[PDB]
Each structure stands twice: as structure tokens, then as C-alpha cells.
């Protein structure tokens, strides 16, 4: 999950079927609970707290 | 559904069910009915439980 949607990472990881990068507002319940492993980035914690 | 046009003009729907209705036998002939009948039929009443279901789903 990401906020700025960097292009170096998005350009990478495209051919890797397991991984996927999504914006903070692009993730759904299924797209999250299916991961079984995720890497939240630093700031979206505050935004998620605000949105609750 | 389209509400039955010939129903909403005879059945004022009151609070908490209990569809109200006028009484019949009040439009044509006066002398054949006594004053007791005449001054009872002017008041209005509800619909019995038999036809209540068939009228409620019609409205």
C-alpha cells in the first residue's frame, strides 16, 4: 500500500505475479485479506487513523 | 405495483393497519330502512379479518 505511487517500484514488481502495489484508496477487503503478507509504508498510518 | 385505482378511493388507511371503510346501503332508498338502520349505517367501520389480508395487499 502506498500514497505517492512511486514509479521505480511500480515499474518493477510488474512481472512478479505474487506481489502487487496499490494506492491507499485502491485496496479492498479481498485485496487485503488475501495478501497473508503486506508492507504498509510509513505515513498512511495517519491517514488510516483519520479514516478509521 | 400500480395501486388498484378502485381501492384507494374506498379505503382510508389508518395508523397501525385497521383499514377503514364506509358502510354500504346508504345511497339509494331511504324509506325501506328504519331510523335505527339509517343512523347506524352513517358511521364508518373497519374490515373484518377475513378480507383484511386480501385488501391490504391490494392497496
Amino acid at each position: 500500500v502506498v500514497n505517492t505511487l512511486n514509479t521505480n517500484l511500480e515499474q518493477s514488481t510488474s512481472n512478479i505475479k505474487n506481489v502487487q502495489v496499490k494506492h491507499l484508496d485502491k485496496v479492498s477487503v479481498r485485496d487485503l485479506m488475501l495478501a497473508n503478507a503486506l508492507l504498509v509504508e510509513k505515513e498512511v498510518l495517519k491517514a488510516l487513523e483519520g479514516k478509521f | 405495483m400500480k395501486v388498484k385505482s378502485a381501492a384507494k378511493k374506498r379505503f382510508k388507511l389508518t395508523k397501525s393497519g385497521q383499514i377503514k371503510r364506509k358502510h354500504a346501503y346508504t345511497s339509494h332508498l331511504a324509506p325501506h330502512k328504519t331510523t335505527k338502520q339509517k343512523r347506524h349505517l352513517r358511521k364508518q367501520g373497519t374490515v373484518s379479518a377475513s378480507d383484511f389480508k386480501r385488501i391490504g395487499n391490494l392497496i
Binding site: 479481498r30 | 378502485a6 374506498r10 364506509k22 374490515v47 378480507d51 391490494l58
Partner: protein, 148 residues
């Protein structure tokens, strides 16, 4: 919820399959009975019908409509039984829209109503008040202003 296994608490009810053998019930007849009119396709005759006999709604005389072709002029009503729960003074249009009791895109006369006692004084400018509603709101040492 471990998508490999997800469950609800209780929502899966018996589905009445109509043409699926006598073992489950609902055999050849699918629950239509036996050889009636309902049993035939497109049965279940018109909702208001009593088999030729004059139906109930046709017997009774019609309610009249004195004011014919007109819509009863609607009123927005403040019942004092609940306005106390709405903590606010100087009740008016400029405030009720903030509390979302009414909407900005609405030019409608405001009416006051109710018999319940109220503790803290309030202030209204509305178009109509009930007699004893006015008495009650005045007894609370409030006030009311009558807009035409």
C-alpha cells in the same frame, strides 16, 4: 478471515425446488395442488376477485374528496416531546439547517406543537403554535415570536 475458509453465522435457508422428485416433497405437482385452475399455468386469478360475485371494494361507496385536485399544504413540525433532546436555543431556519432537521432548499412554514413540560427556556419564531403548547413554552420562562 482466512479466505480458504469463510463462514457466515446463520443464513442459508431451505430452497423449495418445485420439480425435483417426490423424495424432497413437491413432486410432479410442484405444490400447485391437483388439476385445479391454480394448477394450470398462469393461475392465481386477479388479486381483487371473488369468482364473479361482486368484489368487496366494488360494493362500498366512495370516499369523497372535498378539496379536489389540490395537495394538502405540508407543514414542518417541531414536537416538544423531542426538541429537548436537540440541544439548541434561538430555534430558527438559520440553525435547524445546521442540525439537519430541515434542508436549505426548502421554503416551508414552521409549526410548533406539543404538551410535554420543558425545563430550560427556548426561543422560537414560527407561524403557528398550539394554545397549550404556547402555554407550556411560556411557563418555562421562554419566548415565541409569531412570523406571518
Amino acid at each position: 478471515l482466512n479466505q480458504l475458509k469463510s463462514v457466515p453465522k446463520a443464513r442459508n435457508h431451505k430452497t423449495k425446488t418445485l420439480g425435483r422428485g417426490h423424495g424432497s416433497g413437491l413432486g410432479k405437482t410442484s405444490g400447485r395442488g391437483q388439476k385445479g385452475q391454480k394448477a394450470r399455468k398462469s393461475g392465481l386469478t386477479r388479486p381483487g376477485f371473488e369468482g364473479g360475485q361482486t368484489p368487496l371494494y366494488r360494493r362500498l361507496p366512495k370516499f369523497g374528496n372535498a378539496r379536489k385536485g389540490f395537495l394538502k399544504q405540508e407543514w414542518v413540525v417541531l414536537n416538544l416531546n423531542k426538541i429537548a433532546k436537540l440541544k439548541l436555543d434561538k430555534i430558527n431556519r438559520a440553525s435547524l439547517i445546521e442540525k439537519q432537521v430541515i434542508s436549505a432548499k426548502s421554503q416551508l412554514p414552521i409549526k410548533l406543537i406539543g404538551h410535554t413540560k420543558l425545563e430550560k427556556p427556548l426561543h422560537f419564531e414560527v407561524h403557528k403554535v398550539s394554545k397549550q403548547a404556547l402555554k407550556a413554552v411560556e411557563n418555562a420562562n421562554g419566548s415565541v415570536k409569531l412570523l406571518e
